RNA sequence: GGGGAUAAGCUCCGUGCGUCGAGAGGGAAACAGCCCAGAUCGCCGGCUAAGGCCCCUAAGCGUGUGCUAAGUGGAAAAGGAUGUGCAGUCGCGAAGACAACACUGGUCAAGUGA
RNA sequence: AUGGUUUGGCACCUCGAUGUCGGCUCGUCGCAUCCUGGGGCUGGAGCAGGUCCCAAGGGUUGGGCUGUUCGCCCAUUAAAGCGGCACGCGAGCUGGGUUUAGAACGUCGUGAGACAGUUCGGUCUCUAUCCGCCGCGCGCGUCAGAAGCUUGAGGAAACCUGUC
RNA sequence: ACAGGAUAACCGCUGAAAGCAUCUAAGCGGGAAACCUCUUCCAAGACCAGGCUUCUCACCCUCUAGGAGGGAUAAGGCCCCC
């Protein structure tokens, strides 16, 4: 069904295809993932597979997480995540301890990458919501960037929950869809994905098969 | 009301099973199952028929009593020898044929048109211009006949398309 | 003076009501009366002296007229244009319990004591309940003829 | 009303029967009897039932 | 009753007419002017008025005979409409009625029309 | 017959203060739908329309003249919708118009002066207490104290279209 | 976006009341950028405060032994530091 893997965003570079066109590609370290736990309807109510990624020294894990990993039967890993499947026949091909690597994907496949967007801090409406600021001249007094009108004239006399104003921005989980995998470097376990994936370099990303184009 | 007071004859060669209001009938052409309305009871007449008895005389019962009778009549005449619907085309360049259990039409569109045959019906095509569909239920046969009629919009000018006999 | 319940006076009993072919208003009114404790001679509006009520066969409730496809259960999120409306039919086919829950809840006081009384009502769409350990007493909706 | 309905009788019919029977106990002591002495309330319900007419809906 | 467009929650007059003003209590969800009723104080007594008795909410998922399918009840007009109950007429009709197969003939089989 | 979107009428509302038009910024709602979507009849041959139903998810341009709303015009576009919310929005902005004090023209008055006639110029104050809204924490709760991974009742976002 | 469900105008099949007829009062179907799912995100303070697991899984003193209070701890967390 829908395959998936945990990886790390390494950076972005440039490649040329067989038509000599340029292809801006993001490098993803789709390293080895180990299945740690299997979610089943009969036990958890839903079907999903749990993957572990990253390497950490054994003295950095707390006792509960170390105990969970030992009960699973594998060495602890830095990151743990779940892949929600659709049914038991989908989860029948995963068993605890099985190692997932990058070559599950093929050249030309369409993938969905999920990551945490970059942080932008306390951002104003001009940046957060694309508001058009007021005039920078012609007598405008200290309103060059303020949003302007909020509500109107009494009536509800309130502000209509969901009003777009300034606040914290970024640092939210974001999924980019229908990204084409240009090349699967099996020996480095590296995926060359055409396009831009969310997050900073060295961040955790989840590469899943596309839900629309797959 | 008037039609329902006459019990419908039941052939001896076809089994009629009555379970309260749920009725199942096994004929030579197959089997069909019908449910009767709750204000009306039904009973297999011992002289080779069934009894359409209406105990109330209010608008609802007087309305559905004849309807139930004619539904029973249609069900028995469909389990005995079924139904057959005949179709044909008017015009030129239109060709109709049977591809196994599925119907393929070339009405003149740039793409081929396929018709899916549901259960209980079959397609008889003795000529490209004219063809037939047969089944044991009148409602299903009529619905499929209308669907097959619908592949062309009505033509009040040349009358090109399909029309009933 | 008039009798007033003390700390240890209140006692509760468990009633299970079958909702198969029952008018929703009638069942809801009976359940609200049972929950309120109006049927006990020691009733006091101050105290929650009601009884735990279990409702099974919630999906089998009876709705007269055409209210199945013309009565709406409204709810507003608060956002602009956040009004959502569902007829009793889809509400029953999706969340069978919620219809009876709303019907019963609408019939008891909207006070804080009503919120506390809501804690004593359990409804189930199936024909069986997990509260067999309490040995509920079957309850039949009867009318005292006058 | 709760105590009377526990004895299969409505409050209004019970009051009418009590008035017909001549018992002059007010509602305060009636409620006190219902809460504290159910047997006395049952006896009063019985005498009220006895005092009631045969057909309550008759034009009498 | 006048003025205004007999429109105004408009204005001006008449009334051994009322209420509020200067008036609490109950009802009309809230609600000076509508309905019941004029508070000397206390009571953990009773009977009632207007209004009500499925739950919120005190007291009737009251009894008997019918109507309503529209949630009418729980907003409104000209006008339109094979909804239905009751009653009253008339047309035609077992010499076979209507339908079905303008007016006429045959099968059929009680009601059929305004 | 609806509506209070137009001018009205009354004056119940505030003269121990309720900013008066346009524009900018930001909205939300109705459908009596401008395009896209689904159909009917065509006095519809096809194209394209005419007209009438269903449909409010999205979209609905940039300029010249005028303070303008309105309007006319220039290019386009799938289309350049109609309205409600103090004819939304000045403790958000502007002061071009109107609506003080200066001055002039025409007209009226003997005169001081005046003109829902015209023209030039002419201070837009405030450190957010409460509700409201956008974000972020502290405390407690979820019947021992913790830690990983999550199900989701419920809610929000998005929904356009052209040519070949 | 694709796909599915129920639908609006509409197109229908099967036929009564009303011996015929009638997309209709019983029924069964098709039918839209609208509706419910479907895509993305938030979400158990969802007081019905959820679920699957894993870890510690114990040591005193006091008033009076009914409960309470105090102390020291385990898993773990925070503060100080980079």
UniProtKB/Swiss-Prot annotation, chain A:
The gene is rplC. PROSITE patterns: RIBOSOMAL_L3. Keywords: Ribonucleoprotein, Ribosomal protein, RNA-binding, rRNA-binding. Pfam families: Ribosomal_L3. This is Large ribosomal subunit protein uL3. Part of the 50S ribosomal subunit. Forms a cluster with proteins L14 and L19. The keyword rRNA-binding applies. Signal peptide: none annotated.
UniProtKB/Swiss-Prot annotation, chain B:
It comes from the Bacteria. Part of the 50S ribosomal subunit. NCBIfam families: L6_bact. InterPro entries: Ribosomal_uL6-like, Ribosomal_uL6-like_a/b-dom_sf, Ribosomal_uL6_a/b-dom, Ribosomal_uL6_bac-type, Ribosomal_uL6_CS. Disulfide bonds: none annotated. This protein binds to the 23S rRNA, and is important in its secondary structure. It is located near the subunit interface in the base of the L7/L12 stalk, and near the tRNA binding site of the peptidyltransferase center. GO terms for biological process: cytoplasmic translation. Belongs to the universal ribosomal protein uL6 family. The keyword Cell membrane does not apply. GO terms for cellular component: cytosolic large ribosomal subunit. Keywords: Ribonucleoprotein, Ribosomal protein, RNA-binding, rRNA-binding. It comes from Mycolicibacterium smegmatis (strain ATCC 700084 / mc(2)155). PROSITE patterns: RIBOSOMAL_L6_1 (PS00525). This is Large ribosomal subunit protein uL6. GO terms for molecular function: rRNA binding; structural constituent of ribosome.
UniProtKB/Swiss-Prot annotation, chain C:
It comes from the Bacteria. One of its GO terms (cellular component) is cytosolic large ribosomal subunit. One of its GO terms (biological process) is negative regulation of translation. Pfam families: Ribosomal_L13. InterPro entries: Ribosomal_uL13 (IPR005822), Ribosomal_uL13_bac-type (IPR005823), Ribosomal_uL13_sf (IPR036899). One of its GO terms (molecular function) is structural constituent of ribosome. The keyword Isomerase does not apply. Keywords: Ribonucleoprotein, Ribosomal protein. Belongs to the universal ribosomal protein uL13 family. This protein is one of the early assembly proteins of the 50S ribosomal subunit, although it is not seen to bind rRNA by itself. It is important during the early stages of 50S assembly. Part of the 50S ribosomal subunit. This is Large ribosomal subunit protein uL13. It comes from Mycolicibacterium smegmatis (strain ATCC 700084 / mc(2)155) (Mycobacterium smegmatis).
Swiss-Prot record, chain D:
Signal peptide: none annotated. It comes from the Bacteria. Transmembrane segments: none annotated. Disulfide bonds: none annotated. Binds directly to 23S ribosomal RNA and is necessary for the in vitro assembly process of the 50S ribosomal subunit. It is not involved in the protein synthesizing functions of that subunit. Belongs to the bacterial ribosomal protein bL20 family. This is Large ribosomal subunit protein bL20. It comes from Mycolicibacterium smegmatis (strain ATCC 700084 / mc(2)155). The lineage of its organism: Bacteria, Bacillati, Actinomycetota, Actinomycetes, Mycobacteriales.
